[PDB]
Amino acid sequence: MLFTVTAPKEVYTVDVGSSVSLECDFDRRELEGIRASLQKVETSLQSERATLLEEQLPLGKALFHIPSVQVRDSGQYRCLVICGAAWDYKYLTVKVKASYMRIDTRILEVPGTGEVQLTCQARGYPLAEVSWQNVSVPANTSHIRTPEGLYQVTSVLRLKPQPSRNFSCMFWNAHMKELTSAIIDP
């Protein structure tokens, strides 16, 4: 046979908590004996997360649906199609993202020092950087991983409170090319 599989799109970028539909096309000219599958490659076992949408097979498309994609679903996959005594495959990459959209803020006065302590905290993916707008004093920024694999990023700024000044913490998610921010009025 002349049987081949093609992948029109090699990289899928997916919001955490939304679905993907990973696609490989195949040569219909080269139906009962067709076997299409998806493996996650990490070993490469068959995916238990993806459902083959088998109604697309007649159109020459192997489409695999994964609901509610999580950080652990990121990585490389192999679509495989076997047709009689022939087979072919392609690799696909799922990149995941989660916007740092919910930013929790806190204001406290630090006992003894007279300084104020400002905190911003947000969860997202991949790792964000934080800066504070028009502030010369560096903040202390750190992260942990959440049970679902997100980053929880916390930035803490300690300084003498200057009159009528609001402070804005800016989360930069480089991979998303996204800036999100929150304003703190002390």
């Binding site: 002349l2 599989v5 068959q46 495989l80 005594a85 087979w87 495959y89 690799y91």
Partner: protein
């Protein structure tokens, strides 16, 4: 496991080049593909060997020959051209008892 050697091969245009794909286990139901890597490391099928026959995808210069010991195969590019330069591998599939796919490491061809 599969090996694909030599890891590097350099020949002049017109040479009939050979890589050897060597399988730890041979079975009559095994199907063997010869792939080329794209610039993004995607696999692209060049030829296949199944049921004792070599089948090229789109260029008949790509020929697979099973050697007498059944486990070694010559992956031959007849009449090499500069455009053949790239990375290649071999891949095997078995269906029984369970599904199993293995790939060799890549090998680089340079045609000058």
């Amino acid at each position: 496991s599969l090996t694909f050697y030599p890891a590097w091969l350099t020949v002049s245009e017109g040479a009939n080049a050979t890589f050897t794909c060597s399988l730890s286990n041979w079975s009559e139901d095994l199907m063997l593909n010869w792939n080329r890597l794209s610039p993004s490391n995607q696999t692209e099928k060049q030829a296949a060997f199944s049921n004792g026959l070599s089948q090229p995808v789109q260029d008949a210069r790509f020929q697979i020959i099973q050697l007498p010991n059944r486990h070694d195969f010559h992956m031959n590019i007849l009449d090499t051209r500069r455009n053949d330069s790239g990375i290649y591998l071999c891949g095997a599939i078995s269906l029984h008892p369970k599904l199993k796919i293995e790939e060799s490491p890549g090998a680089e061809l340079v045609v000058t």
